[PDB]
Amino acid sequence: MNYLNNIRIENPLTICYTNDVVKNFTANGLLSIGASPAMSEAPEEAEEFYKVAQALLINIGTLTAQNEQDIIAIAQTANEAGLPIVFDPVAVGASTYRKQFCKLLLKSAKVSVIKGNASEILALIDDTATMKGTDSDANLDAVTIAKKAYAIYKTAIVITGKEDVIVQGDKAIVLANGSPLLARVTGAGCLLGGIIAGFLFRETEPDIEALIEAVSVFNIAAEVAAENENCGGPGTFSPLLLDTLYHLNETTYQQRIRIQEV
Amino acid sequence: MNYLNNIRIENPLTICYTNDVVKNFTANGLLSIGASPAMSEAPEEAEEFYKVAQALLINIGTLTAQNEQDIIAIAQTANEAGLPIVFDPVAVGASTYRKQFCKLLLKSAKVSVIKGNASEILALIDLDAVTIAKKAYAIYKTAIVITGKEDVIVQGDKAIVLANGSPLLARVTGAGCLLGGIIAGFLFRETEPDIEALIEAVSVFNIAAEVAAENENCGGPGTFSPLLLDTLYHLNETTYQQRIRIQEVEENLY
Amino acid sequence: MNYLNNIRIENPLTICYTNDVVKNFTANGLLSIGASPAMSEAPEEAEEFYKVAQALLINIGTLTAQNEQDIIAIAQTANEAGLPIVFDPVAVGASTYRKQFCKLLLKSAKVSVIKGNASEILALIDDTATMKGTNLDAVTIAKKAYAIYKTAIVITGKEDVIVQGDKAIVLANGSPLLARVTGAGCLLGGIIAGFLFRETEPDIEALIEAVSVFNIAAEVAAENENCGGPGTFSPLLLDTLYHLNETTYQQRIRIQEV
């Protein structure tokens, strides 16, 4: 756990422009691993915040007309500042509104990681694709979709699912950690977007190892939290997830990581 | 527990336009009973979302000028789509601002359930929850749920009084704003819902609250909230049937 | 615990205009001590809400162009209604945008408590450009701020500082786990509001009791045998606030004058 040690020591300022359902959970997840979250949404303070920040998360869960301009503006401010952007195109497949916005954003700014479930990333690369908010199952290959998305955007792609897929540069990786209770907790993937941002340390082209570690730290903590004897369900799980992220050590991480290339 | 089994299996898409204090808790309550919550607030996507959704919740807890037009617009889009609306007129009696807005909304769109406490519903129409709920039903021709010590439901020609739940619910900020969401989860795209679905929504919620508050690890309103979510997640037919408490009136008028 | 008993009995309507990360936790914190929170943000209902309310919290954690005017308007409405205001200038030192806004607000309205950490309050007074002839500890900063604003100052930190009228106090309760929970200080702003009972110039004893209740509850929660970290801490903090009694309070309070 190279990068996590550095997060706990350096306390990286991690800006989050995220959706209204998950702000509190995202901030508590970041605080638990030692990062310094800031949910700054005013374009007027983006320049000064971004100079000293290590990453920015943009998550469009609750996109409205009031957000659209601000989001484009702060993405551009981030590019000018060399601040890496993690982008979560939540439920992009569910509306033509979200598809058009995501297209505009990816034409207006370079992002450093694109993270979503299989249907979300599919809808990005194929605008006839369709979803609810959740992901169509049996999607074709998360691996094939991630590789196609990488070729199009030349940006690291993370596809979450039963198993998680990461594509960066010439490598593709499949990870197989976590718990089913994660899917019954509303912040989870939106929180993962924030955690990934916490691992970037101002690298606009992040090392795949940093992404692998972000996802594995999150999923291993979930795994362990769900095994706790006081985990009685999705309610009690969530405080335990945060405890487990706080205490996670090298030994547990190395014992539990499940990873495979190509 | 006819309806709850179906929610767990079908995973109904349940749109929530609700207040900024309760969004997270409402989404988690829904997820715990197997629904699929989506807090979509842009009128620009309402048409597409609503076509495939099973209900919409409108809760005005944190109503501001920025919400007013959007809410009226999406309620109209829900009506055009045949998507049932649950309406929570939060604190409508506390300001003329809310009274005027609720009036405009109910003049602009047909809703499928109106839910509040007694003084909220009273303030809508202008202690005795049953009478108030009947009066409100006559005016709006829409199912009324009034929450209180005992809960009242009026739909079509029936009125019912329910007596489940816990005092700790009143010391948790999401509770009733969550109940609005849960009820939306039980609608399955019926614009005129069966009273049995509303009875089940309310009883599931209150029975889970009862059982959560009896848990040995419940030490107060803090620990009660996670346990409430656990208990909604696990709630079974046996516990439901053992604990439900009802009282009742048939054949009312027009 | 004079004031806390009265909160549990009287159930004071406490209006919170606070940031989007902490609304729910602030409402639950207020509910747990017996207060009645209302997160009303429309200027259009402020006059009616404020007539019957006991305090207003204003916390600028997620300040945007859409908040600025509304916040100035409601502060003015609060002044006209005699409703006391607790003001949390979150991260004011981090941008010119926040510095200018906090200035505008404090030129536009009289607040009843100003709460922040040392570097927030220091940035407030450094930007007033009044401190001719001015390392600095919290006590000195709080006194400098009091002289400028003539308004109770609470500075949170390792030890907490309160300055009201001619007294300064240093408190030493709490837990490090508080710093690892995102609502905490923003919640303390709301708890302090809950203790004001419509006093625009609150007695320092009320402010002492607000802060000590909060920090003593945090202390006890963190000792609980089911507290395994910042996650489980938060629900136990709410439980502890709900059950906190006179005996625990008197046993644990740690307080020193100037």
Other C-beta atoms closer than 10 Å to the C-beta of B5 total 12
Q: Return the HEC string of chain B.
A: CHHHHHHHHHCCEEEEECCCCCHHHHHHHHHHCCCEEECCCCHHHHHHHHHHCCEEEEECCCCCHHHHHHHHHHHHHHHHHCCCEEEECCCHHHCHHHHHHHHHHHHHCCCCEEEEEHHHHHHHHCCCHHHHHHHHHHHHCCEEEEECCCEEEEECCEEEEECCCCHHHHHCCCHHHHHHHHHHHCCCCCCCCCHHHHHHHHHHHHHHHHHHHHCCCCCCHHHHHHHHHHHHHHCCHHHHHHHCCEEEECCCCC
**Gap between the Cα atoms of C190 and C1, Å rounded:** 18
| CA quadruple C217, C222, C224, C228: dihedral sign | positive
| CA quadruple B25, C22, B42, A112: dihedral sign | negative
**Largest Cα–Cα separation, chain B:** 49
End-to-end CA distance of chain C: 22
Chain B residues whose CB is inside 8 A of the C218 CB are: none
Q: Range of B109's domain?
A: 1-254
Would you say A239 and B226 are in contact if contact means Cβ atoms under 8 Å apart? yes
**Interface-testing mutation among B24, B97, B120, with chain C (most C C-beta atoms within 10 A):** B97
Q: Show Cβ contacts of residue C159 under 8 Å, excluding neighbours closer than 6 positions.
A: C138, C170, C171, C172
CA B188 to chain centre: 14
Would you say B61 and B88 are in contact if contact means Cβ atoms under 8 Å apart? yes
Q: What DSSP string describes A150-214?
A: HHHH-SEEEEESSSEEEEETTEEEEE----GGGGGSTTHHHHHHHHHHHT-TT-SS--HHHHHHH
Resolution in A: 2.1
Q: Specify the residue for token string 């990816």.
A: A106
Provide the CB-side half-sphere exposure for C251 (13 A, CA): 9
Chain B residues whose CB is inside 8 A of the A65 CB are: 42, 44
**Gap between the Cα atoms of B251 and A151, Å rounded:** 67
Q: Which residues of A touch B (CB under 8 A)?
A: 19-22, 24-25, 61-66, 91, 94-98, 132-134, 184-187, 230, 232-236, 238-239
**Gap between the Cα atoms of B198 and B204, Å rounded:** 10
Contact B97 C234 (CB under 8 A): no
Is C151 annotated in some ligand binding site?
A: no
| CA quadruple A176, A180, A181, A187: dihedral sign | positive
- Experimental technique of record: X-ray
Chain B residues whose CB is inside 8 A of the C66 CB are: 66
Contact C32 B217 (CB under 8 A): no
Is C39 annotated in some ligand binding site?
A: yes
Here the CATH number for the domain that contains residue A224 is: 3.40.1190.20
Contact B11 A134 (CB under 8 A): yes
Give the nearest partner residue to C41 out of B64, B94, B95, using CB atoms.
B64
Give the nearest partner residue to C235 out of B66, B94, B222, using CB atoms.
B222
Would you say B166 and B210 are in contact if contact means Cβ atoms under 8 Å apart? yes
Q: Which of A32, A31, A29, A34 is nearest to A6 (CA)?
A: A34
Output the six-digit token pair for C71.
Answer: 């916040």
- Strands laid side by side in the B158-162 sheet: B36-38, B13-17, B55-59, B85-88, B113-117, B143-147, B151-155, B158-162, B246-249
Chain A residues whose CB is inside 8 A of the B37 CB are: 133, 186
Other C-beta atoms closer than 10 Å to the C-beta of C59 total 27
Q: What are phi and psi of C162, to 5 degrees?
A: -125, 130
Q: Show Cβ contacts of residue C3 under 8 Å, excluding neighbours closer than 6 positions.
A: C195, C197, C205, C206, C209, C210
Domain count, chain A: 1
Q: Show Cβ contacts of residue C5 under 8 Å, excluding neighbours closer than 6 positions.
A: none
Chain B residues whose CB is inside 8 A of the A236 CB are: 226-227, 229-230
Would you say C96 and C123 are in contact if contact means Cβ atoms under 8 Å apart? no
Contact C239 B225 (CB under 8 A): no
The strand pairing partners of B241, in sequence order, are none
Give the nearest partner residue to B39 out of A20, A24, A230, using CB atoms.
A20
Q: Show Cβ contacts of residue B6 under 8 Å, excluding neighbours closer than 6 positions.
A: B188
Output the six-digit token pair for A185.
Answer: 């907790």
**Gap between the Cα atoms of A158 and A150, Å rounded:** 10
Search chain C and give the residue with CA nearest B222: C235
